[PDB]
């Protein structure tokens, strides 16, 4: 494929509002998307106060790094809050979700194999 | 089926070769866990350097802390916390810390690149 290097301020990427049956109060920035990635994609998620990504599972893994705030992670059994500087590995098919129980925006990097889209 | 951990608590590996000095690397999500790509966290001391190199796989980076000097095929460019970098396969690249404090970034590569 193409040559070169992209270097960009992540916040300059246009966010997309996510509103589905299981997601509310979330915006996503596709940093390294399907148009460019040979193998896996990089997204930056922002969750507003009270926002929620309800428990779900999917047949690809997810790799996360928490960039800002206190993120509540929903698990098959119960929940756990993590903060900036934590990483999360979600195995394929593992139940997971996310909630923001704080008064300010929470952000994380999420990477998936490109077969799961962007 | 879910790992949640503070990245700092992963023991860093000092890297010192002919080509790399003043760098520590943490493997956060490595080959034991990852089906497709790995997650590392690099910390570079003031004056640390990863000399120009290239590899057959791509690299995806997110700058977490500080002002990172990126060595390119042509010259160099400085970036800061909050920048992402996409390095195409085979693109020459390296890194330097010209500041007086530690610089950190996340680096992800496909598993063919090892951890
Ligand atoms: Cu998911
Ligand atoms: Cu499980
Ligand atoms: Cu490299």
Phi, psi for residue B88 in degrees, rounded to 5:
-65, 155
Please give, rounded to a whole number of angstroms, the shortest distance from the CA of A77 to a CA of chain B.
11
How far is it, in rounded angstroms, from Cα A75 to Cα B72?
42
**Burial (CB count within 10 angstroms: exposed 0-12, middle 13-18, buried 19+), residue A48:** middle
* Coil vs helix vs strand at B24: strand
Query: Among B111, B93, B114, B106, which residue's Cα sits nearest to residue B40?
Result: B106
* DSSP state, residue B29: E
How far is it, in rounded angstroms, from Cα B58 to Cα A40?
10
Question: Which pair of structure tokens corresponds to residue B97?
Answer: 């810390």
Query: Among B81, B15, B73, which residue's Cα sits nearest to residue B42?
Result: B15
- DSSP states along A32-94: E-TTT-SSEEEEEEEEEEEEEEEEE--SS-EEEEEEESEEEEEESSSEEEEETTEEEEE-TT-
How far is it, in rounded angstroms, from Cα A105 to Cα B90?
37
Q: How far is the CA of A24 from the centre of ligand 1 (A)?
A: 14
How far is it, in rounded angstroms, from Cα A1 to Cα A15?
27
Domain boundaries, chain A: 1-118
Is-contact B58 B32, C-beta < 8 A? Answer: no
CA-CA-CA-CA dihedral for B91, A28, A56, B60, to nearest 10 = 10
Looking at the CA of A94, name the nearest ligand. 2
Residues with beta carbon < 5 A to ion ligand 2?
A 94; B 1
How far is it, in rounded angstroms, from Cα A18 to Cα A53?
10
Placement of tokens 């270097």 in the chain: A7
Query: Among A93, A111, A55, A1, which residue's Cα sits nearest to residue B84?
Result: A111
Phi, psi for residue B7 in degrees, rounded to 5:
-60, -40
Q: How many CB atoms lie within 10 A of CB B100?
A: 8
Placement of tokens 């428990």 in the chain: A55
Question: Which pair of structure tokens corresponds to residue A39?
Answer: 């193998």
Cross-strand pairs, A68: A107
- DSSP states along B67-107: EEEEE-SSSEEEEETTEEEEE-TT--EEEE--SSS-EEEEE
Q: What are the Cα distances from residue B32, in Å, to A20, A86, A87, B3, B115?
A: 34, 19, 16, 12, 10
Cross-chain Cβ contact B7/A87 below 8 Å = yes
Give the total residue count for chain B: 115
Residue of B nearest to A31 (CA): B84
Please give, rounded to a whole number of angstroms, the shortest distance from the CA of B82 to a CA of chain A.
6
Looking at the CA of A63, name the nearest ligand. 1
Resolution of the experimentally solved model in angstroms: 1.2
How far is it, in rounded angstroms, from Cα A95 to Cα B37?
20
Q: Which residues of B touch A2 (CB under 8 A)?
A: 88
Is-contact B100 B81, C-beta < 8 A? Answer: no
């Amino acid at each position: 494929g193409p040559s070169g290097m992209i270097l960009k301020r992540a916040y300059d990427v246009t966010p997309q509002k996510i509103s589905t049956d299981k997601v509310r109060g979330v915006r996503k920035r596709v940093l390294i998307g399907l148009k460019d990635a040979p193998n896996f994609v990089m997204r930056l998620f922002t969750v507003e106060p009270g926002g929620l990504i309800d428990r779900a599972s999917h047949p690809w893994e997810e790799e996360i790094f928490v960039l800002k705030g206190k993120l509540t992670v929903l698990k098959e059994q119960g929940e756990e809050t993590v903060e900036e500087g934590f990483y999360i590995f979600v195995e394929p098919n593992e139940i997971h979700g996310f909630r923001n129980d704080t008064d300010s925006e929470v952000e994380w990097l999420c990477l998936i194999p490109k077969e799961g889209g962007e």
